[PDB]
Structure formats: C-alpha cells, structure tokens
Paper text:
Rotaviruses are the leading etiologic agent of viral gastroenteritis in infants and young children worldwide and are responsible for an estimated 140,000 deaths each year in developing countries. Diverse interactions between histo-blood group antigens (HBGAs) and rotavirus have been described and it is believed that HBGAs expressed on the surface of target cells serve as viral receptors. The distal VP8* portion (~27 kDa, N-terminal) of the rotavirus spike protein VP4 from P, P, P and P genotypes recognize the secretor HBGAs. To understand the molecular basis of LNB and H1 recognition and binding to P VP8* we determined the crystal structure of the clinical isolate Pc VP8* in its apo form and bound to LNB and H1 glycans.
Author numbering: 4 to 162
C-alpha cells in the first residue's frame, strides 16, 4: 500500500489497483481513452430520494437521476462506449467504507461492484487500454495486482 496521493490526472500502468478514498459526494473519478471507453463514478450519500443531480464529467454538464436508499454509500459507474451514446449506470458499488477501486490489466478494466462487505470485481473491455487516463478527485492509494486480496479487504472493510 503506497500513498496517499493527492487528487490528480494521470495514466497508471497496467497491473496496479488505484484505491480512491472518496470523501466528497459528486464525481469520484473520470476515466477515458476518448474512443471506446468512458466511465465516471458518482458518489451518493445515504438515504437519498429520487432526485436529479448535475455532474460535470469529461467537461460536460450532465444530469442523472439518482437515489441511494441504503445506510451505505452508493458509487455509480456511469458508462458510455462512444462519445455520442448516453451515459448509463452500468455498475453500482454500495459501501460503507467509501473506497472505490480501478485496475487496468489483461487488456480490460476491472472495478469493484456489489455491496460491501461482499463486493467483487468485474471487467470491462476496450480496444485501447493503454490510452485510458484517469482524473481522480480524492486521496488515493496504489496496490500491485499481486496484493489484490488486500485491495479486496480494504474495499469491503476499510483501511
């Protein structure tokens, strides 16, 4: 576990988990290669009714209807696969640790989803993995993929 590091924009190598300590609602990260992959994660505070909210992602002011009906936080993965398609809520991570993870490896993006403490990983395909950069809005850490067991622990139970 290396970090914490301050909010920034960069392109991580493959084979490292980025573990973001989300401490603000709104946009947690923005990741794209500008060709076939866009994901922005949006943090939602507990006990929220279906309310529309504005989110400036990839320089675009977007509107999403969100609703977190769980003592836990909700992290929604907004995805689109072309610049012209609408974002959709592809995956959600419900957690009380407020940690979000992203890994680039094997040519596909890996993230955690489901509900803590039993969130697990899932993958997304791309034709240009190397080009996917990330703007991180919160203090984050880096953990090698060889220590994924620890990343999983952190995701589901905290630092």
């Amino acid at each position: 576990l290396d970090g914490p590091y301050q909010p920034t924009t960069f392109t991580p190598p493959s084979d490292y988990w980025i573990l973001i300590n989300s401490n603000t609602n709104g946009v947690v990260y923005e990741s794209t290669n500008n060709s076939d992959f866009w994901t922005a994660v949006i943090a939602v505070e507990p006990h929220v009714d279906p309310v529309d909210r504005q989110y400036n992602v990839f320089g675009e002011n977007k509107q999403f209807n969100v609703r977190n009906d769980s003592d836990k936080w909700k992290f929604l993965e907004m995805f689109r696969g072309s610049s012209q398609n609408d974002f959709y809520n592809r995956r959600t991570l419900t957690s009380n640790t407020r940690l979000v993870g992203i890994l680039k490896y094997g040519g596909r993006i890996w993230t955690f989803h489901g509900e803590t403490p039993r969130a697990t990983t899932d993958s997304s395909n791309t034709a240009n993995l190397n080009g996917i950069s990330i703007t991180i809005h919160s203090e984050f850490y880096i953990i090698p993929r060889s220590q994924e067991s620890k990343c999983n622990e952190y995701i589901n139970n905290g630092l």
